[PDB]
A paper describes a structure:
The MHC-I molecule plays a crucial role in antiviral immunity by presenting antigenic peptides to activate specific CD8+ T cells to clear virus-infected cells, while its downregulation can activate NK cells and trigger inflammatory responses. Bats possess distinctive characteristic in their MHC-I molecule, with prevalent 3- or 5-amino acid (3AA or 5AA) insertions at the N-terminal end of the peptide binding groove (PBG), which may generate a unique antiviral immune response. To explore the influence of the 5AA insertion on the structure and function of bat MHC-I, we focused on Mylu-B*67:01. Mylu-B*67:01 contains the most common 5AA insertion sequence, MQQPW, and also exhibits the D61/R67 pairing.
To explore this hypothesis, the COVID-19 P1 peptide was mutated at the P1-F position, generating P1-T and P1-E mutants that were more compatible with the P1 residue preference of Mylu-B*67:01ΔMQQPW. The insertion of MQQPW brings D61 closer to R67, but the salt bridge network is only formed in the presence of P1-E. The salt bridge network induced by P1-E makes a significant shift in the minor helix formed by MQQPW. The interactions between P1-E and 61D/67 R is similar to that of Ptal-N*01:01 with an inserted MDL. From the surface pattern, the change in the position of 61D allows it to participate in the formation of the A pocket and to form a salt bridge network with P1-E via 67 R. The P1-E mutant peptide was less thermally stable with Mylu-B*67:01 compared to the original P1-F peptide, suggesting that the acidic residues are not the only preference for the P1 position. The MQQPW insertion introduces a new small helix and pushes D61 closer to R67, allowing them to form a salt bridge network with the P1 acidic residue of the bound peptide.
Author numbering:
A (entry chain A): 1 to 280
B (entry chain C): 1 to 9
C (entry chain B): 1 to 98
The structure:
Amino acid sequence: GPHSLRYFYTSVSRPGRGEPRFLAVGYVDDTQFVRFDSDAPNPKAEPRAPWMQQPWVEQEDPEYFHRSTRIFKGAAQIDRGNLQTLRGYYNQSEDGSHTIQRMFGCDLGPDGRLLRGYNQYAYDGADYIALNEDLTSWTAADMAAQITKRKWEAAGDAEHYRSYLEGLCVKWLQIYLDKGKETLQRADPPKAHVTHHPVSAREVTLRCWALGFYPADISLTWQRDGEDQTQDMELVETRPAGDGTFQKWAAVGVPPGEEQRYTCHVQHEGLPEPLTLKWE
Amino acid sequence: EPQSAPHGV
Amino acid sequence: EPRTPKIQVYSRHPAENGKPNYLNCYVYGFHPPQIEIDLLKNGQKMKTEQSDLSFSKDWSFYLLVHTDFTPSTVDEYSCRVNHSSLAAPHMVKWDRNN
C-alpha cells in the first residue's frame, strides 16, 4: 500500500472529576512515533519510536517536540470546547461522560505528492462528520452533524485542511520515512508453520501460525481439497508481538486421518510469492 | 506534525 | 450502547518452561475507552506496561498490556478485564497454544 501519516485524538469528559482527558498518538503505517496525555504532570509530545530519539532531531530540528506540544495543547482545548457544544446539540445532561475521536492525516503517492487525505470524527463511537476524499465536501451522520457541516462550509474549513494535507502532512510523512527508513521502509514476511492439537476421537485442531510480519495486513486461510474454508474455521484478530511485528493464526477442526486434505495459505507484501503449507 | 481544527464543532 | 472488549492472552514466542519471554494481553473492539487490564500471576496482579490508547477504522479502542516473564510448570497466568459494557470482570487464562 501507500505510506500513511495518521494522528488519533481521543477526549473523554468526566462529570464531577474536572476537565476532559485528551490523548493524542501518531503513526507512520503500523508504527507509533509520538504521544500526548493532558493528564501527565507536564504534558508534552514525547517520542514513542527509537528513530524519533536519534541525533537528527536535536541536530537539525531541536524545537520539534515543542511545536507538537503547543499543537496538542491547542487540540486538547478545542476538544474540551467540542464536548461542551455536542452535549447541547444532543440535549444530554452534564452528568454522563461522552467521547470525541478524530483521525486525520495523508497517504503518500509515488509522485511524492498527496494520494488521499482524511479528517473524520466520531461522537460516543459513531460517525459524526468526515471530510470526503475530494477534500471539498463533508458527510454528516445526523441532524446534529449538519450543524457542524454548515458551520465548516461557511468558514471554508475544508480549504484550510487541504492546505495542511498538501503542505505539512506529506512533507513530514516524507521526513519520517527518511529518518526511520530501517523501521518504516521495510516488509518483514510472515514465518508460517502448522501445529496439531487433538480435541476428540472425531476432531483434531490444525492451527496455521503467521509470526514476525510487518506490516499488519495479511491473508491467512485454510483450504480443504483446494476449496476455501474461511466459513468453518477460527481466525483470530491480528495481534502485536510487542517488538514491532504482528501475529495471527487460523484453526480448523478436522476428522482425524483427513489432515492431508487441508492446506494453509499466507499472503503478505513481504512475500515474493504466497505461501502454501500443510501439517508436517 | 499534527494540526488543530481552526474551529470547534 | 457500550461495545464489549475482545481479549487475547499470549506469549511473544512459543513458551518454554525456564526460558525468558514476554506475556501479552491484547484487548480490542471496545467502547468507551476507560478500561482496567491486569495480567495476573497465580491470581496476583503483575507489574505491567500498557500501550498508548489508539483506535481502529470502526472507532473501537485497542490496548496491549505486557511484561517480561519466564513460564514454569507450576505458574498459571490470566488477564482480567473490567469495562462499563460488562457486569463482572472478563477472565481469560493464558493457554500456551493461543
